Design a protein around this nucleic acid. Structure first.
Ligand SMILES: [Zn+2]
Lengths: 206, 98, 155, 127, 80, 60, 24, 125
RNA sequence: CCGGGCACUCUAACGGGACUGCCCGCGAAAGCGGGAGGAAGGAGGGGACGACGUCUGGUCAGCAUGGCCCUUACGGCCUGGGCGACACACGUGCUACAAUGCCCACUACAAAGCGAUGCCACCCGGCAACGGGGAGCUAAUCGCAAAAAGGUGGGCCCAGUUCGGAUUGGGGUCUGCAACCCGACCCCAUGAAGCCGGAAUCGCUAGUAAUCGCGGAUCAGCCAUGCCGCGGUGAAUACG
C-alpha cells in the first residue's frame, strides 16, 4: 500500500484544483460543504451525460459551476429544458444564486474518469475484465496519449479470491513530478461486491 | 489615500490582480506605492496517512494565504473609474479602506 | 564507516592560546553544548595553574597530555574459541582522544568541590607523573605487555 | 567615508559599518564588550580585522538582529569580513584563505515525523 | 483541597423534595440519581438512598458528613 | 457513525457542553478538524482530489 | 527542578504564573 | 534555640532552621522572620535572646505546629474514614486518594512491589 | 518617537549561479585525485516522492460494499455507573538523585505560529490562581510573549541538603447544568523513593547527538510528561 494520488501530488503544477476560490476562518468550512452538496447531485444525476469534472469558481453570492461532459446534450436537455430543472434544483440547495455552464469533453477517450467509468460499467454488466481492460488501454492509447494504464481491483469474474488486473502502454511516469497524468477512479457495485477501477492517462509532459 | 489589501491563495492570481490595479490607476491619481508584498500566513494540517493505527504515517498539507497592499494616495475620480469595475481574477478577494 | 575513511573534523584554535588541542580538551569538558561554562572552567583552571605553579599553564597542559597518552593498548579478538586480548600500538590520533578523555574523567573523579579546580589540579598531577589520569594510562600499558604472548595475532 | 558588509549565520543578520577611526565597536548601541558581556567567543567577530592589521585603524557601527548572540558573533564576523573588502578589494587574497568570506550554511534540521528530533528515533524493547 | 466557588450546588430534585418533608418533620427514605449534589444541613437526619449506577444504597446523612457529596457515600466499583 | 448517533445536529444540547464536531461527510467524530468540518481522513482524501481550494501538499 | 510546582522553573515548565513566577 | 514543641534548629540560617519544625516551610520562614524583624541569614547560634523570644512567641502563637498539628491531620483522616466517605475508604484500603491510576505507579502509597505468579505468552510487554 | 528617506535588514515574486564548466595529474572511456575562482560543488544541506511483488499484513469501528444475523428488538431515548478498577508483569516516556548544581535578583539575543466574544495591552483588588475595569487588533502596524539555556551579583557548602518533588491534610480559583466516582490551576503545611541503576538493551555520523525554551492542531475545561513543528547553545568518534 504505497504511492500518492497522481493529482494531489501534482496540484502545484500540471493540474489545477476543482474549486478555486478564496475564503477563510468563519466561512471556508461552510463555503466548502456547499461545493460537496453541489457535486453531490450532479454526479447523482448527470451520470449518463458522462461526468468528468466539476469546476466551481466564486466571488460572492454568484457561484460558477462548469460541469464537463462527454454528451453535453443529455445535460442541457430539449432546447435547454433540463438545464432549467437542474439550474433551479441548484438554488433549492444554495440560495446563493449560481450559474451552470457546460463544456464538452474533446474525446472522452483521454478522460481518466471516463475511461474508468467506462470500464467500471462494463464490469457491472458482466464483461470479461481483462478484455475490457486491454480494450480500454487500447482506445486511450489508440487516440492520442503518450501513455495509459488501467487497474481493476479484485473478485474478478466474481471469483472467491480477490485478484488484481493490469494493462499498460507507453510512458506513464508516476514519479516524474511534471508528467501530467490524468487519474480517474470508478467504483462498481456488484452482486458479489465492490470492485474499484483505476485509469491513468499520460499526455505530453513539460 | 485609498488603501487596498489583496489576499489570495495563488501567488499569481494576485501579482496579476494587484498589478492590474497598479497600471490602471497610474493614469488618474498619484503614482501608487507599488504592490508591496506582505508576509504569508501558512496553515499546516498534519494527518495520519491511513485509518486505524500506523501512528507514524502522516503526510503534510498546508493552506498558505498571500497578501498584497499597493496604496493609492491622491484619489481622483478617474482612478475610481479605471478600477471601480474592471477586475478579472476569481481566486482573489479584496478589502479596501480609503 | 564502510566506504570512506572518515576524515578528522578539524577544530578552530583556542580563543586565547590559538591552540587547537586546547579546544579539543575544552570540548571534552563541555556537556549539553554549554561550551561557555566549558571554556571558562578550562581558563579559570589555567589561572589556577599560574598561581599554585610558577609555570605557564599551556606548557603544564601539553606536558600532562604527554604523560597520559598510552603507547600500547589491548584490543579484544576472537581467535579459535576464546577471546584473546591482543596488545598493539595506538594511533597518534587515538592517543590524544584517550589522553584528553582520561584527564577530564579523572579530573571529575577528584574531590575538590570546584570543577575548575579539579581540572587545574589534575593537569598538574598529570605533569608530575601522578594522578588518576596517568593511572589508567599506565594500567593500559600494563594490561598489554602482560598479554604480550598473544601479540603474534598482530592484527 | 564609510564601508558596508552584511553577514548572515545560522539565521542572524549583522549590518557592519566600518569607518576610519579609533577601533571601537558599537553593537546595537552597547559597546562590543557590553553586548557580548562575558562570552569567551566574542573575540572571534573581529578576527577578520586582525587578519589585515585593522581594528586600531578602523571603527565599526553594527546592527544585529536574529538568532542568538553566538550566531550574531559569526554574522558580525562575516560582516566585518565583507565590508573590509568594499574598502580595499585586495584584502580577499588573505582574508579568503581563512574562509572568513564564506557563509556557514549550517542551519537547524527540520523535525521529521515519526522521529523525536529529526533523527533521534524512538526506542524499542524486546523487538 | 476541593472547590466549587460561590454557590454550593445541589440538584433540586431531592432538595425541594427533602425540605418538603421538613414540613411534616422527616419521612422514611428517598432515592435520587443526583449523586452530583452537595449536602446541606436540611439533609441531616434524613436517609437518602444514592445510585451505584446499578443500586440504590441507603445513606444516613449525619452532621459530620455535610459538606460532602452523597456519591462519596455510595461506592461505584466492586473490588477484592 | 450511526444515523441514530448523528443527533449532534440536534442543537438541543440541553446544555451547550454536550455539543460535538462530527465529520460533515462520514461522521468521523474522532478527529474532526474545525477549519474544514472534515475528519483527518476525508481532509486527506479531498486534498488529493483538489476539492480543497488552495490546500496543496506541504514540504520543507 | 522542572518538577517543583512552587519555583521559577516549576512554573515555567507547567506554563503558568503565581507567587513564584509573577507576570512582572 | 529551642522554639516550638521540642524544636531545636541550630547552627544554620534561621529561616532554613525554622524549616526543621513540623508546620514550618520555606514560606512561613521568611514571614516569621519578616514580621519579627530578624535577619534571616543570621546563624541560629549568632541569634539574640531578644530575637529568640519574639520568634519563639510570634511563631508558637500564630500557627498550629508540631504534635498538635499531627493531631489535627490524624484527626481529619480519622473522620472521612469513619463516615462512609469514599476518600476515607481509600485511606483504609491504603490506596491513593486523589484519584490517580492504581494499575501501575502507586508504589509511594502501596509500598514495595508484591510480585505474584502470572501469565507469560500473552505479550504483556 | 517627528518630518523625511528607501539605502540596509527584512517581506514575497522573479531572475542569475554549479556543469567536473576552467587548470595540473592518471585513465581507452566513464571517472578518481589535486588546485583556482566562488556563498556554495562534484548528488552543497533537509523534504515531497517508494518499482514488479511479499506478509491469506491492518482496518467491515471512518466511510464504501457481497454474504450471514437482529427487528418490541443485537434498534432508539434517558439518568447514573463503566472505559479512570488492582496482588502483580512489560513497553514508551516525564522528573530526578545534584556544586559543569539548586535558589533569588538584575540584565541580553529567536523562530515559527495562533487571535470575535477571540488574543488580551494598561490600571485596580488578591501572596496567588484569578476577579473588576478597560485600550488597541479584524492582526508585518494591537495581543498571546516571558524565550529558556545565557551574562552579572548574592545566597547554599556536600548534607538526603536551599538536592529531589511523590504522597497526604487544609484553603481557594476557573471552565462547565454539573468536577464523589473522575478536571486543571493557585497558596500553606507535608516532603516519600531516589546518592546514578543486575542480566540484558535503545538512539544518533554535524548543526547531528546532547541540552534549553517557544508555538500549534484537538479543544468549555483537561489529566500534553504525548504528537506535529520552531529556533537557541553545540560535541565525541569512526582503525576498520
Ligand atoms: Zn470524514
Amino acid at each position: 500500500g504505497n504511492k500518492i494520488h497522481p493529482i494531489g501530488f501534482r496540484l502545484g503544477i500540471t493540474r489545477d484544483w476543482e474549486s478555486r476560490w478564496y475564503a477563510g476562518k468563519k466561512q471556508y468550512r461552510h463555503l466548502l460543504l456547499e461545493d460537496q452538496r453541489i457535486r453531490g447531485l450532479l454526479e447523482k444525476e448527470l451520470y449518463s451525460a458522462g461526468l468528468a469534472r466539476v469546476d466551481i469558481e466564486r466571488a460572492a453570492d454568484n457561484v460558477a459551476v462548469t460541469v464537463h461532459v462527454a454528451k453535453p446534450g443529455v445535460v442541457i436537455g430539449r432546447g435547454g429544458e433540463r438545464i432549467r430543472v437542474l439550474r433551479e434544483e441548484l438554488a433549492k440547495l444554495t440560495g446563493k444564486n449560481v450559474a451552470l455552464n457546460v463544456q464538452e469533453v474533446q474525446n472522452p477517450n483521454l478522460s481518466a474518469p471516463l475511461v474508468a467509468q467506462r470500464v467500471a460499467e462494463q464490469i457491472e454488466r458482466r464483461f470479461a475484465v481483462r478484455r475490457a481492460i486491454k480494450q480500454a488501454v487500447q482506445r486511450v492509447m489508440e487516440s492520442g496519449a503518450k501513455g495509459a494504464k488501467v487497474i481493476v481491483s479484485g473478485r474478478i469474474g466474481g471469483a472467491e479470491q480477490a485478484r488484481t488486473e493490469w494493462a499498460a502502454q507507453g510512458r506513464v511516469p508516476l514519479h516524474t513530478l511534471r508528467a501530467n497524468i490524468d487519474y480517474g477512479f470508478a467504483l462498481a457495485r456488484t452482486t458479489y461486491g465492490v470492485l474499484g477501477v483505476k485509469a491513468y492517462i499520460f499526455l505530453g509532459e513539460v | 489615500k485609498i488603501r487596498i489589501k489583496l489576499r489570495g491563495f495563488d501567488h499569481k492570481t494576485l501579482d496579476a490582480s494587484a498589478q492590474k490595479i497598479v497600471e490602471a490607476a497610474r493614469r488618474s491619481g498619484a503614482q501608487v506605492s507599488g504592490p508591496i508584498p506582505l508576509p504569508t500566513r501558512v496553515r499546516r494540517f498534519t494527518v495520519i496517512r491511513g485509518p486505524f493505527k500506523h501512528k507514524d504515517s502522516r503526510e503534510h498539507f498546508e493552506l498558505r494565504t498571500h497578501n498584497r497592499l499597493v496604496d493609492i494616495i491622491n484619489p481622483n475620480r478617474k482612478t475610481i473609474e479605471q478600477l471601480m469595475t474592471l477586475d478579472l481574477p476569481t481566486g482573489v478577494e479584496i478589502e479596501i479602506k480609503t | 564507516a564502510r566506504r570512506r575513511r572518515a576524515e578528522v573534523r578539524q577544530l578552530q584554535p583556542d580563543l586565547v592560546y590559538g591552540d587547537v588541542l586546547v579546544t579539543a580538551f575544552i570540548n571534552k569538558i563541555m556537556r549539553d553544548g554549554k561550551k561557555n561554562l566549558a571554556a571558562r572552567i578550562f581558563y579559570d583552571a589555567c589561572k589556577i595553574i599560574q598561581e599554585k605553579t610558577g609555570q605557564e599553564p599551556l606548557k603544564v597542559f601539553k606536558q600532562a597530555v604527554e604523560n597520559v597518552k598510552p603507547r600500547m593498548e589491548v584490543r579484544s579478538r576472537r581467535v579459535g574459541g576464546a577471546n584473546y586480548q591482543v596488545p598493539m600500538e595506538v594511533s597518534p590520533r587515538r592517543q590524544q582522544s584517550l589522553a584528553l578523555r582520561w584527564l577530564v574523567q579523572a579530573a571529575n573523579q577528584r574531590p575538590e568541590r570546584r570543577a575548575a579546580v579539579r581540572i587545574a589540579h589534575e593537569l598538574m598531577d598529570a605533569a608530575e607523573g601522578k594522578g588518576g589520569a596517568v593511572k589508567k594510562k599506565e594500567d593500559v600499558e600494563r594490561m598489554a605487555e602482560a598479554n604480550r604472548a598473544y601479540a603474534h595475532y598482530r592484527w | 567615508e564609510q564601508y558596508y558588509g552584511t553577514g548572515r549565520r545560522k539565521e542572524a543578520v549583522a549590518r557592519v559599518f566600518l569607518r576610519p577611526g579609533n577601533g571601537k565597536v558599537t553593537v546595537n548601541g552597547q559597546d562590543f564588550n557590553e553586548y557580548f558581556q562575558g562570552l569567551v567567543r566574542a573575540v572571534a567577530a573581529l578576527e577578520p580585522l586582525r587578519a589585515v592589521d585593522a581594528l586600531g585603524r578602523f571603527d565599526a557601527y553594527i546592527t544585529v538582529r536574529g538568532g542568538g548572540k553566538s550566531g550574531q558573533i559569526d554574522a558580525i564576523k562575516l560582516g566585518i569580513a565583507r565590508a573590509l573588502v568594499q574598502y580595499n578589494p585586495d584584502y580577499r587574497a588573505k582574508l579568503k584563505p581563512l574562509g572568513f568570506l564564506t557563509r556557514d550554511a549550517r542551519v537547524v534540521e527540520r523535525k521529521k515525523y515519526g522521529k523525536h528530533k529529526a533523527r533521534r528515533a524512538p526506542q524499542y524493547s524486546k523487538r | 483541597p476541593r472547590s466549587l466557588k460561590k454557590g454550593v450546588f445541589v440538584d433540586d430534585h431531592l432538595l425541594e423534595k427533602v425540605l418538603e418533608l421538613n414540613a411534616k418533620g422527616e419521612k422514611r427514605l428517598i432515592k435520587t440519581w443526583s449523586r452530583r449534589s452537595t449536602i446541606v444541613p436540611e439533609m441531616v437526619g434524613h436517609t437518602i438512598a444514592v445510585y451505584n449506577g446499578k443500586q440504590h444504597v441507603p445513606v444516613y446523612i449525619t452532621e459530620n458528613m455535610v459538606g460532602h457529596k452523597l456519591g462519596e457515600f455510595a461506592p461505584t466499583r466492586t473490588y477484592r | 457513525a450511526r444515523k441514530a448517533l448523528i443527533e449532534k445536529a440536534k442543537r438541543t444540547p440541553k446544555f451547550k457542553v454536550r455539543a460535538y464536531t462530527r465529520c460533515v461527510r462520514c461522521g468521523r467524530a474522532r478527529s474532526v478538524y474545525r477549519f474544514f468540518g472534515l475528519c483527518r481522513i476525508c481532509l486527506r482524501e479531498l486534498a488529493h482530489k483538489g476539492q480543497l481550494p488552495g490546500v496543496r501538499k506541504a514540504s520543507w | 527542578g522542572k518538577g517543583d510546582r512552587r519555583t521559577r522553573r516549576g512554573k515555567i515548565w507547567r506554563g503558568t504564573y503565581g507567587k513564584y513566577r509573577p507576570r512582572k | 534555640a529551642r522554639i516550638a514543641g521540642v524544636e531545636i534548629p541550630r547552627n544554620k540560617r534561621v529561616d532554613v532552621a525554622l524549616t526543621y519544625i513540623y508546620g514550618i516551610g520555606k514560606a512561613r520562614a521568611k514571614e516569621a522572620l519578616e514580621k519579627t524583624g530578624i535577619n534571616p541569614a543570621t546563624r541560629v547560634k549568632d541569634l539574640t535572646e531578644a530575637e529568640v523570644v519574639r520568634l519563639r512567641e510570634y511563631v508558637e502563637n500564630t500557627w498550629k505546629l508540631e504534635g498538635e498539628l499531627r493531631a489535627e491531620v490524624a484527626a481529619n483522616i480519622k473522620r472521612l474514614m469513619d463516615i462512609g466517605c469514599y476518600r476515607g475508604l481509600r485511606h483504609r484500603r491504603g490506596l491513593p486518594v486523589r484519584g490517580q491510576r492504581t494499575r501501575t505507579n502507586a508504589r509511594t502509597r502501596k509500598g514495595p512491589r508484591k510480585t505474584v505468579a502470572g501469565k507469560k505468552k500473552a505479550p504483556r510487554k
